[PDB]
A paper describes a structure:
In this study, we present a new, four-protein structure of K. lactis Edc1–Dcp1–Dcp2–Edc3 at 2.84 Å resolution in the catalytically active conformation with bound substrate analog poised for catalysis. To trap the substrate-bound active conformation, we screened different Dcp1–Dcp2 constructs (S. pombe, K. lactis, H. sapiens) in which the catalytic Glu was mutated to Gln to prevent cap hydrolysis for co-crystallization with magnesium, a tight-binding two-headed cap analog, and coactivators Edc1 and Edc3. Edc3 Lsm domain binds an extended helix at the C-terminus of the Dcp2 CD, as in the recent Kl Dcp1–Dcp2–Edc3 structure, and the fully ordered Edc1 activation peptide bridges Dcp1 and Dcp2, similar to the recent Sp Edc1–Dcp1–Dcp2 structure. The conserved YAGxxF Dcp2-activating motif creates a 3-way interface that bridges Dcp1, Dcp2 NRD, and Dcp2 CD in the catalytically active conformation by threading through a narrow channel between these domains. Tyr359 of Kl Edc1, the residue most critical for activation, makes a cation–π interaction with the strictly conserved Arg39 on the Dcp2 NRD. Ala360 packs against conserved hydrophobic residues in the flexible hinge between Dcp2 NRD and CD, and Phe364 plugs into a pocket at the Dcp1–Dcp2 NRD interface consisting of positively charged and hydrophobic residues. Two-headed cap substrate analog bound at the Dcp2 active site engages conserved residues on the Dcp2 NRD and CD. In the active conformation reported here however, the CD is rotated ~90° from the pre-catalytic conformation, and Phe223 base stacks with the second m7G of our two-headed substrate analog, likely mimicking binding of the first transcribed nucleotide of RNA substrate to the Dcp2 CD. In the substrate analog-bound state, the β-phosphate, which undergoes nucleophilic attack by water during cap cleavage, is located 5.4 Å from the general base Glu152. In our substrate analog-bound structure, we were able to build one magnesium atom that is coordinated by Glu148.
Removal of the m7GpppN cap structure found at the 5′ end of all eukaryotic mRNA marks these transcripts for rapid clearance via the 5′-to-3′ mRNA decay pathway. The CD harbors a positively charged patch for RNA binding (box B motif)25,26 and a Nudix motif with conserved Glu residues that bind magnesium and carry out cap hydrolysis chemistry. The NRD enhances decapping activity by specifically recognizing the m7G nucleotide of cap and binding Dcp1, which further accelerates decapping. The activity of the core Dcp1–Dcp2 complex can be further modulated by the enhancer of decapping proteins (Edcs).
Author numbering:
A (entry chain H): 2 to 13, 17 to 39, 42 to 64
B (entry chain E): 2 to 216, 222 to 263
C (entry chain F): 1 to 76, 84 to 127, 131 to 188
D (entry chain G): 355 to 380
E (entry chain A): 2 to 217, 220 to 263
F (entry chain C): 357 to 379
G (entry chain B): 1 to 73, 84 to 185
H (entry chain D): 1 to 65
């Protein structure tokens, strides 16, 4: 049920990062690269148009 | 719009040659008459046009090699030949030119990467990729789609990645073959020209994977970089069943819909 | 090696050859080295299997009892034009000697002044032609309402094509223009 | 001997149908 | 974390009942002591607790049901029974209260909508969806999630779409069963409480639909809700196929043009 | 005839809304 | 049927029962009808399996040889204290989930730092507790360094507990 | 078929700007849409775009069929 650690991309500006946790309301990333790097990045589903996943931590 | 006759049916050989000369050599833009190598390509397409069509309409016509056809053409219309070199020496210069021309081809895989389509022309007897020479100002992809569509009768316009390829050089000739998958085995394959290729077939990528490691044209020189691709592709498909899962599930927990 | 000699031979052999397809050709009016054809349909352009030298020529239609010959297409297509039948009344012709297959591209050209004589059954289904040039494409609406687009290799001939066809539509036969 | 190509110089110069203008009488 | 003892293993039935009284009935906030029903829920929890835990800690204790349990409790701790109703008549009033409590549940589907997850209770009887009674001031999706987690051990947080549901009123009992897809048939479903759920099994939804269209079977609610269910699986399977064609498309278009 | 169980049965908040200890 | 009778029976019976778990209980100091407990680790709260009435009580440690009992038989589970019984106060949740109750020892800061002044330094290493309220959650840093948060049902009590706990930490213990 | 005419298409430019429209015809070099709606505002009955200016493309609906 957990997908934390998947390589994730979000859009509006595009953010790429590692999934720290997901809830119906909020999404957290680590080592987020900016279309800039940040150790912790907090984003809400309100500011997300779309989401895509490419790579897994296995 | 206007009803045109078919002179090729009843016309003598000299006049049929005249027709071909109008179609292929007499009226080409000057850029195509610059060198012997350039004009000889128009001679070549003209010869093929004679064999594939004109010979079919009038069986009373002779079978003409490219050499013989060139002879009759330069004899019936001497004004379209402005170099004093022998046509049989000009043919060897022609071959000196067609050996430095790049060439693009395709690795044709089914959904199951079991089979890979290769072709066998009449003379060679050793199987090889579907490929051909590049044209003027042509993307390598458009090139590949055109020649693969020619030899195998299949449009690859939606099956080619500009990144999944592998290239090597033989003797100054820059080869380049892309890697495609998902071609339907069911759909038939036919050369667009009847007299170019004998057989177009595929067998299991494994059944003769290591038959070549006894030590098959060109495919052997790039089997290892190809092998990496096919195995990567199978396990990446098994992965493909999973990435979808994760994607849609994460999408449902948010306002993605 | 002579330019003038080769020019003469080119025009002459082109006439001799086109004559065997259209036996009523009388004079070559214009020629361009290469042209590609598209047909308009389904509100979209569709590249046709015609490619080669293009020529516009005058035709002999003084005989008012000659009917266009009857030739079976023999099918060697998805969409093929209506081959004109009936009496030969078409002053001008356009042809593309095809490099792709042995079927050449053909368009008849008739002035409006000729086709509006229908007044006073008809074997003809003729409507005034149209021609326009835009974005280097030469678009033509034929006498049977087919819409084709000719793309000429040499750019300065594109306009030259348009201006010729337009002339041939506004005036009756004269033997007067390039 | 390099940069060499084959066939007619005009073989692929015809533009693709997606780049052509729409006629003003259709 | 100070070390405590385990008196339940070694106390007489009376002192064990006193323990349950301080755990479930004596110290609850005032609203839970307002009506006979509000407290009878606590009696019920205490009886379940006795049966599941303390009876298996001290095998000298007898086997009680909620009726005998209520008897003994009101015997040992009379000061908690505030009303002048026979505990039995109070029980009939308790069932009458339960009769009209909204029930939220979930029709749960495999990602390939071939099978649907159903369960049967201790009296095997029939099969139905995981479901439960609504709590105090709780949203229907919170109730559905909580109850399917207690009945199956599975959390339906991300899987529930609050608009895909079926609603049926049978006897003033308002049933609402949500529609969910994409749960793994892999998961091992265990109930959180024993003596509640007899069995948990997937059923072939096609064969089950043919079976409910019997001449006259083995099912509760699902037979009443079968056509909206089937409709849901039609739109979902069809939508999966359309997503396949769509994917084929976008990949091919990105091949015709240049991704790189 | 509204609800079942304890009045406090479903009042416990989810961990995602709780403050950080910070001491 | 009398409010005064029922409250006395509640206090007396609560003491009688808690005494069967912590025999060293001496006096009930505080009680609240319902409380849920969470443990903190991995920078997010985890809801534990304890739920029910909460009681803060005084303990009897006049005896000095007092040694704690033992269980009849990874860091997610708490550490149960061993060694000398020197804990003045106790907190307990009487669980409605399963038979195991929630226990937290409470030793004031003075008694602890005074316990420091003892040669062996062999008895179990402890740490002064802390207590905080934030957005209605009552967080406690235990002797064993574990940190918990308590959500009490009755709103007025959320403050009360805190002050009381704080009181029990800051002051010397008697009566 | 080789044609995907009628598919509902959404494309993106350099600044994440998105164009939505119905696919009229497609070739390796150019893409044509009808009734294109623009994220930042504006409708257009016919919209012609080159593959050079496209950063990503994704598909929404199938043709009504
Ligand atoms: C359009 N059309 C074609 N034909 C029939 O084909 C003949 C004309 O030849 P192509 O130019 S269409 O192409 P290919 O036949 O493949 O020969 P290549 O020399 O152009 O190029 P590579 O084979 S990709 O090789 C590159 C160079 O290295 C040499 N080489 C070749 N092989 C097999 C090997 C080998 O096994 N091992 C080594 N180490 N080197 C090898 C190769 O020789 C070349 O120099 C025409 O005669 C037709 O038969 C047509 N026929 C008709 N009727 N109509 C058409 O339109 C047509
Ligand atoms: C937690 N716990 C339970 N138990 C023991 O096992 C039994 C189950 O627990 P509930 O008492 S909380 O009962 P539930 O199943 O949750 O609800 P409902 O049975 O009141 O009613 P509906 O099934 S939602 O239906 C509502 C109305 O329609 C009628 N109906 C019901 N069924 C199944 C059918 C059917 O198959 N066919 C038809 N035609 N109608 C049907 C229904 O009768 C009603 O009128 C409890 O009783 C306990 O004995 C536990 N035991 C222990 N030791 N520990 C626990 O924690 C526990
Ligand atoms: Mg239930």
């Amino acid at each position: 049920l957990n997908f934390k650690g998947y390589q994730i991309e979000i859009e509006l500006k595009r953010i790429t990062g590692t999934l720290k946790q997901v809830s119906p309301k909020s999404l957290t990333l680590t080592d987020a690269v900016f279309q800039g790097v940040s150790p912790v990045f907090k984003i809400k589903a309100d500011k997300l148009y779309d989401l895509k996943v490419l790579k897994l931590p296995p | 719009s206007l009803p045109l006759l078919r002179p090729f049916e009843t016309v003598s050989l000299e006049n049929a040659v005249e027709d071909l000369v109008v179609r292929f050599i007499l009226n080409v833009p000057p850029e195509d008459l610059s060198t012997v190598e350039r004009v000889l390509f128009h001679f070549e397409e003209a010869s093929w046009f004679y064999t594939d069509f004109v010979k079919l309409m009038n069986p009373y016509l002779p079978n003409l090699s490219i050499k013989s056809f060139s002879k009759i053409v330069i004899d019936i219309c001497p004004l379209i030949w402005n170099w004093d070199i022998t046509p049989e020496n000009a043919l060897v210069k022609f071959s000196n030119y067609k050996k430095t021309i790049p060439v693009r081809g395709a690795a044709i895989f089914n959904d199951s990467l079991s089979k890979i389509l290769l072709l066998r022309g009449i003379n060679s007897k050793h199987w090889s990729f579907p490929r051909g020479k590049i044209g003027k100002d042509e993307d390598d992809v458009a090139c590949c789609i055109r020649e693969v569509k020619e030899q195998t009768g299949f449009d690859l316009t939606g099956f080619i990645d500009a990144d999944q390829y592998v290239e090597r050089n033989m003797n100054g000739k820059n080869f380049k073959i892309f890697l495609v998958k998902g071609v339907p085995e069911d759909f038939e394959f036919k050369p667009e020209h009847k007299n170019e290729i004998q057989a177009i077939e595929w067998k299991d990528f494994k059944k003769l994977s290591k038959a070549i490691t006894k030590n098959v044209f060109l495919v052997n020189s790039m089997i290892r970089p190809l092998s990496l691709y096919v195995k990567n592709e199978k396990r990446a498909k098994d992965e493909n069943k999973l990435k979808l899962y994760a994607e849609e599930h994460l999408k449902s927990i948010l306002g993605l819909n | 090696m002579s330019t003038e000699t080769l020019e003469i031979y080119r025009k002459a052999l082109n006439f001799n050859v086109i004559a065997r397809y259209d036996p009523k050709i009388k004079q070559l009016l214009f020629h361009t080295p290469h042209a590609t054809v598209y047909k308009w349909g389904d509100d979209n352009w569709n590249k046709l299997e015609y490619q080669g030298v293009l020529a516009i020529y005058l035709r002999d239609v003084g005989d008012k009892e000659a009917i266009l010959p009857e030739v079976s297409s023999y099918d060697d297509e998805a969409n093929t034009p209506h081959v004109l039948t009936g009496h030969d009344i078409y002053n001008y012709g356009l042809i593309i000697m095809n490099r792709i297959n042995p079927d050449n591209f053909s368009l008849a050209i008739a002035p409006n002044s000729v086709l509006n004589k229908r007044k006073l059954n008809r074997e003809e289904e003729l409507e005034p032609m149209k021609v326009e040039v835009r974005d280097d494409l030469v678009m033509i609406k034929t006498l049977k309402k087919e819409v084709y687009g000719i793309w000429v290799h040499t750019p300065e001939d594109r306009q030259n094509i348009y201006e010729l066809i337009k002339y041939l539509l506004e005036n009756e036969p004269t033997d007067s223009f390039t | 001997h390099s940069k060499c190509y084959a066939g007619a110089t005009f073989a692929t110069e015809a533009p693709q149908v997606t780049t052509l203008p729409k006629p003003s009488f259709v």
